[PDB]
Nucleic acid binder design. Structure first.
Lengths: 785, 345, 200, 285
RNA sequence: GCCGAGGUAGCUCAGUUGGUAGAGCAUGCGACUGAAAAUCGCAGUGUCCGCGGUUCGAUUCCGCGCCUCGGCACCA
């Protein structure tokens, strides 16, 4: 909020130490944002009475004649500049705050200005620099300093939460302190009203927008500026004073969450209608605008026989021209409970942020309008003289709060505590509750202002708040989890274990946003984004990622742009959205790669990253093949899709040079699988003890043929006793019959029992030789050399 | 290779064609009229200007663009690689099955609030069996076969770094460390002590020289047998899933009273696996810890404390779970055998 | 990456306390996200989080027991949506922690951000009390800032919890009282929604 | 980490046969058994490598593997009792299978070491110092974060022949190694000065020498510093070796006014002259 | 909704009297080079938010929207 200390001590005196308070509150739940000392009134600012105001010829200035207890002039330019009021004179030679400069005796247009009368900002009590301060001319003995009656102030910025709409007025707060042990001094503004008919009616049209309405009548108004203590207050809160009548409207708004408007009866007509604004209706909203209305808006209007006209936009602004001023002599005081959303939308539509709307959008004591009337009229009767009418116009019957169960021990079984019953009754019974119970279940009815108190549980945090969250002991639970919950961590750990291995392996983890710019779909030649944002952070952070590589490369580029690294082997594992939502693993290679630093030769490129893949896969207990299959984004000649334990989970390849050039960067190699990959359980094969048959050979096969082809054939023709099988030499050219490639294979046989009688490796080799012939694959010891 | 660097230097000839031209062209309108060009407006300020200038763009953007289509094509002929082919021969790596089996059991329990400390392999009679209520000439000494040690030099630092008086040996069980913990620290705590253990035994498929155990305890005020039953169960659940049972039968152990042997139902294994032996710690083990603590001017800590401890050989589970033949294998450090556990999470 | 170390460390701290870690969907659905957690619309509670509201055809939002969901699409403001997705699928008691990436409509700077990571969690079962959360949140302070660390609890407002509070942790050598998180005893209406759905 | 890195974990007994002390040329066993399982399982291990190699041998004897990169971390007894980390390399090593060229030997295992160390947040130097068991020409002791925790080298060919097996490379550190806490250095946004050079230095000289000199003469604004080319022979004045260095300067605030990289380079040039180290742009070409 | 500033390359950015629309840097090519750095000698990529126009280049101006900012008060 914005809490003036002295003011709060008005309702709860014996408070002392604003810091001890700030502490008290944050313990109750309110986070004080800042504390501020305000009102450093210079010694040189005294209180003068304006005697006369004469114009200084053909110019805008006015030559006021004052008396700081010794009649003196000062020439002002301000509009409010007139005889009859009290002003704040900054004697010549007075050092001012907001002014920065010092005042002195100065000559203005022919007159000798003896100091100068100050505006609020000038003095420094609020940002209003367009007008002198205005005090009742009888205020303080003409000439006494102002500091005497403007004691400095401590104001604290609270942070009131949405559930606490009673905490938007000093008395809501006060009431909470009272629960802790403080004495509540609720001001009794007992007025003197004479019974006579109020000259206006009140007809409510939409009762579910203004459930509870009230019109009060005070006439005989002597509108003047409001007394110092009241100006000190309004400013002290972060408001500006206008006239005793409107100030009493703000004062009580601040005192108890009740927004109220006083309307000059002049502009009322026959009575106040409260309805939904009819299409084509425009009002000149108080701050000076012509807000063209919408039929969803709720309006406080007046009518003259036929036509119905707008006087203020209900529960938000108003003012228009019906606003209270100098020549006011009677007013209709508005004090109603509006429906939060009928306001909350209307105010979020027109672009309004009023102290009064803010109050209504949260919610107000749906039974506090009547008491609010009295405060305001009694206040108004004192301050403005007004004779008030004992007779309000109450329209809308409100319903008293509902009573909650509350079993004291439930409260305890929940908190782990052991607060005695009695003690916890008092907590509520002195938070202002109706506790009508014999026990053990009590049945409590909350005061009208506590909307936040619906359930029994709302009640428990009430007992554990006054008591203190610092009285709930520490304890730990012991328990046998339910069977089905047992193991849910497993999918997770397997994914976390993958980042670990991907790491010790040799990949630097990167994290990229999940936002994709629609744009990339074309640059990276991929299928169009599935989801788009309704409120993107930027046109480029518009849709979400269908792949991780766009960002991985993007990210890479930005690194060349900044760090000119020589190589990089990153990896990422974020969420990818398209059709469904999946976890993906991707990473790119780049630069020189492995090898020797003082040796001109590196080892890198595709087979590097391809090797890092098999390295990884093996250490995963999984099977890994890359079969060829050009993908849109990859390079046509180096593109294949990753095949883990039988299945296709992703791709591995280079980049399409179109894009490489398109993105200013050089060759990159990458992959993107989808998780989770499978898990193959431990197949414990016991190995044999007897040696193995180390035989060997080579195959010719047609140039544009694949390795995984020859190899799959070799392996299943080799039979069961084959063990290893590794390509150890490749050949392109002659002595080969032009257009073939000799693939050399280290074979290896072993029997899991006796050894191998050799002629057996032979007949084995026979089938391999056979299936090569049965395919068009010649040999070394048989078909080409 | 061929059409790329040739024309990229050759288009740079055009970049140098824009500024060998850019000067003669900029050395007309800017040099004949800096201050006096808006006086020589029509003809001159339109001919050598506007006209020639558009050349400095069309030829720039054309040798800059009509080069990418022919050069980027030269790379499409080059990397026409065999996608499938053994890639770089990086080393795989991988763990040993005792590590998986150990760590798994270390997790199961840590997840239950347990901490893992590790003790010395080379122990000292007092700490090993003795402090655990196993005095000499005790048929309790006959339940373990000690490798008794001999050598000069070795300094056996005990608990709080102080050197120890006792006879040297190789720890039969990891319990020696159960006491080394209790002297140094104060209760309560829940700890598990894994480590290598050594028996004087006849190496075969089911028995062995060296082995690994994990033992542990939980001591503190109010601990009861019910608690060990609680834990030993949670271990059965997390190891053999939600249809697993535990069984407790009394047995004799010098360091515990009461004592028992847990057996765990292995649902799909159909048999009642054995596993370990545990029990509520013995009163005399608390006296020894306190007696020693006082020797070290360390106030006594286990006066009003209760406490259970358990112990199970890793080595077994590692064979039941990862289905292995004989115990010798692990220590027979064989490659083709070990290589089957490189893939386990 | 440091979020991984920081995340895993916090995942360990709690797992070590008997907690399990499940992970939820990033792309949530109004009902599951704020709603099921007692946050109906036109609620100044909706104003405490800034939602990226989503749009697109194709995406199938499988809920808890693989069944598809009826609701308005968005990017999870907090990881709580998964607190309820857990409760429909499983039975009590349990102690779980749900880490994940979260998304706010906010103005990126040195202290504020677009994308972020949270770890939330709960423990539900018969007999759990506030004392228990005080117990845990403490154990987290101990294992993170060592044995001279304190925790502080002050009430605060949260739609899904009653009572509610904000924990602050004393950072011994940091000399300051760090803020950290916000927690509370789960709200009765969050149990109704889970059961209402379960019955569906 | 030792695992994802690329090392296959091995576990060996902790019994040592007294015998090895001579074969492996190491200090005599500290503890002996009173009731050994066998004369060969008589005393306990003062090192892990005896067994690691032993174990390796038994594998050639049985499986004829082509390479192996193992590692072990058991308890070692002598004077006190410690945890040790050891592992040996062997065979062809990394490279391409269908390419006649491999990449291996000492620098392989030496690289796997620095790979490891970096991912550990620790500093790693190998300085020369022949050890009894290693090979005289390829033997140095491992220096982690300032300190000497072990060695890295080959095997003394006496033993290689003594044990029927070929060349092996190994190391044995002592644990725990240190832990250096996170020193968060914020990097600059302004580019870096990419300058470069080469030094002649006398043949039997070390890399870590030239490099330590270069680095502390480079001042505070040096960033990287990498050897990228070594040279033995002419156009060099016979008996020298030209070590080429990619330098790199960067200011953590404004950029580098160039003449500043120059005066910086001046001190590096200076300290080379002040040592007997000539250049390229100044002393030999 | 508001009152005034910035958005210049492969980074960082002053920015006007427009004449070399850059300067620090950094980038490429031909001699020196076993091979790179200094020197040499040579020229450059740069949508200056995105688009409407103006001079010769469109960043000195003037439009709408963009991205980043200082003041209007309540938000996991």
């Amino acid at each position: 909020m914005r809490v003036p200390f002295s003011w709060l001590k008005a309702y709860v005196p014996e408070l002392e130490s604003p810091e001890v308070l700030e502490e008290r509150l944050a313990g109750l739940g309110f986070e004080t944002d800042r504390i501020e000392r305000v009102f450093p009134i210079p010694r040189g600012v005294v209180f003068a009475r304006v005697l006369e105001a004469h114009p200084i010829p053909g110019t805008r200035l006015k030559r006021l004649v004052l008396d700081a207890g010794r009649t003196v002039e000062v020439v002002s330019g301000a509009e409010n500049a007139r005889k009859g009021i009290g002003v704040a004179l900054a004697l010549p030679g007075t050092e001012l705050p907001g002014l920065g400069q010092k005042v002195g005796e100065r000559v203005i247009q022919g007159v000798r200005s003896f100091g100068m009368a100050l505006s609020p900002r000038e003095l420094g009590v609020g940002e209003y620099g367009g007008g002198l301060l205005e005090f009742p001319e009888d205020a303080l003995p003409p000439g006494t300093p102002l500091s005497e009656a403007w004691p400095e102030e401590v104001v604290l910025d609270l942070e009131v939460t949405p559930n606490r709409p009673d905490a938007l007025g000093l008395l809501g707060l006060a009431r909470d302190l009272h629960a802790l042990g403080y004495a509540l001094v609720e001001p009794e503004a007992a007025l003197k009203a004479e019974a006579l008919p109020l000259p206006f009616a009140l007809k409510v049209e939409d009762p579910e927008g203004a459930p509870h309405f009230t019109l009060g009548y005070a006439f005989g108004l002597r509108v003047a500026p409001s007394p110092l203590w009241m100006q000190r207050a309004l400013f002290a809160a972060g408001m500006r004073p206008i006239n005793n009548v409107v100030d009493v409207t703000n004062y009580v708004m601040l005192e108890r969450a009740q927004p109220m408007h006083a309307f000059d009866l002049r502009f009322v007509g026959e009575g106040i209608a409260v309805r939904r604004a009819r299409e084509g209706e425009r009002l000149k909203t108080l701050d000076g605008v012509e807000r063209t209305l919408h039929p969803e808006d709720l309006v406080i209007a007046g009518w003259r026989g036929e036509e119905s006209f707008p006087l203020g936009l209900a529960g938000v602004m108003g003012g228009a021209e019906s606003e209270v001023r100098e020549d006011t002599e009677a007013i209709a005081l508005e004090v109603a409970c509006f429906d939060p959303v009928s306001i909350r939308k209307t105010a979020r539509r027109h672009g309004l942020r009023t102290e009064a709307s803010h109050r209504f959008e949260r919610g107000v004591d749906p039974l506090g309008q009547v008491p609010a009337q009295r405060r305001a009229l009694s206040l108004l009767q004192a301050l403005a003289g007004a004779r008030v009418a004992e007779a309000l116009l109450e329209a809308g019957s409100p319903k008293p709060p509902e009573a909650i169960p509350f079993r004291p021990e439930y409260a305890n079984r929940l908190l782990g505590t052991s607060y005695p019953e009695a003690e916890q009754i008092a907590i509520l019974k002195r938070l202002g509750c109706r506790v009508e119970g014999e026990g053990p279940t009590y049945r409590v009815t909350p005061p009208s202002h506590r909307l936040d108190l619906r359930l029994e549980e709302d009640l428990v945090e009430e007992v554990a708040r006054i008591q203190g969250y610092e009285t709930i002991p520490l304890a730990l639970p012991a328990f046998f989890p339910a069977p089905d919950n047992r193991g849910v961590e497993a999918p997770y750990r397997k994914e976390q274990r993958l980042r670990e291995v991907l790491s010790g392996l040799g990949f630097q983890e990167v994290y990229t946003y999940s936002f994709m710019d629609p744009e990339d779909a074309r640059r990276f030649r991929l299928d169009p984004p599935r989801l788009l944002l309704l409120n993107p952070l930027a046109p480029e952070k518009a849709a979400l990622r269908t792949h991780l590589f766009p960002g991985l490369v993007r990210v890479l580029k930005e690194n060349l742009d900044l760090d000119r690294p020589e190589r990089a082997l990153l990896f990422e594992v974020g969420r990818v959205f398209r059709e469904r939502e999946e976890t993906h693993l991707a990473g790119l290679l780049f630069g020189e790669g492995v090898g020797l630093p003082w040796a001109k030769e590196r080892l890198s490129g595709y087979f590097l990253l391809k090797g890092y893949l098999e390295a990884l896969f093996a250490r995963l207990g999984l099977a890994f093949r890359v079969e060829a299959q050009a993908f849109p984004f990859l390079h046509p000649g180096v593109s294949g899709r990753v095949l883990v334990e039988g299945e296709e989970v992703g791709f591995l390849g280079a980049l399409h040079p179109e894009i490489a050039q398109e993105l200013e960067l050089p060759p990159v190699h990458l992959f993107e699988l989808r998780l989770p990959l499978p898990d193959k359980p431990l197949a414990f094969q016991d190995p044999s003890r007897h040696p193995a048959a180390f035989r060997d050979l080579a195959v010719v096969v047609p140039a544009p043929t694949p390795y995984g082809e020859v190899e799959a054939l070799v392996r299943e023709a080799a039979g069961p006793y084959l063990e290893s099988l590794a390509l150890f030499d490749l050949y392109q050219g002659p002595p080969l019959p032009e257009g073939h490639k000799s693939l050399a294979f280290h074979l290896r046989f072993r029997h899991p029992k006796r050894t191998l009688r050799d002629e057996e490796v032979e007949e084995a080799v026979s089938r391999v030789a056979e299936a090569l012939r049965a395919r068009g694959f010649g040999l070394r010891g048989l078909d080409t050399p | 290779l061929a059409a790329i660097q040739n024309a990229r230097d050759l288009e740079e000839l055009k970049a140098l064609k824009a500024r060998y031209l850019g000067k003669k062209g900029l050395l007309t309108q800017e040099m004949k009229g800096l201050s006096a060009l808006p006086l020589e407006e029509r003809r001159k300020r339109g001919q050598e200007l506007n006209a020639i200038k558009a050349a400095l763009e069309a030829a720039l953007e054309a040798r800059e663009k009509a080069l990418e289509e022919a050069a980027l094509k030269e790379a499409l002929e080059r990397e026409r690689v065999d996608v499938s082919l053994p890639g770089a021969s990086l080393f795989s790596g991988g763990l040993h099955p005792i590590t998986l089996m150990e760590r798994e059991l270390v997790e199961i329990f840590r997840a239950l609030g347990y901490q893992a400390v590790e003790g010395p392999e080379v122990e000292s009679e007092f700490f090993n069996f003795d402090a655990l209520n196993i005095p000499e000439h005790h048929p309790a000494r006959d339940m373990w076969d000690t490798f008794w040690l001999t050598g000069e030099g070795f300094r056996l630092e005990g608990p709080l770094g102080e050197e120890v008086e006792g006879r040297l040996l190789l720890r039969t069980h990891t319990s020696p460390m159960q006491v080394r913990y209790m002297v140094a620290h104060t209760p309560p705590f829940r700890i598990v002590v894994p480590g290598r253990v050594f028996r004087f035994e006849q190496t075969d498929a089911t028995h062995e020289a060296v082995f690994h155990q994990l033992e542990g305890l939980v001591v503190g005020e109010g601990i009861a047998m019910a608690h060990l039953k609680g834990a030993i169960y949670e271990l059965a659940q997390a190891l053999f899933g939600p249809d697993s049972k535990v069984r407790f039968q009394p047995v004799y152990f010098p360091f515990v009273e009461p004592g028992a042997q847990f057996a765990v139902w292995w649902p799909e294994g159909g048999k009642w696996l054995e596993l370990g032996g545990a029990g509520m710690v013995h009163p005399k083990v608390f006296q020894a810890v306190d007696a020693y603590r006082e020797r070290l001017g360390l106030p006594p800590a286990y006066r009003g404390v209760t406490g259970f401890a358990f112990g199970l050989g890793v080595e077994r589970l590692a064979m039941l779970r990862y289905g292995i033949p004989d115990i010798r294998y692990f220590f027979g450090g064989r490659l083709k055998f070990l290589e089957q556990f490189k893939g386990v999470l």
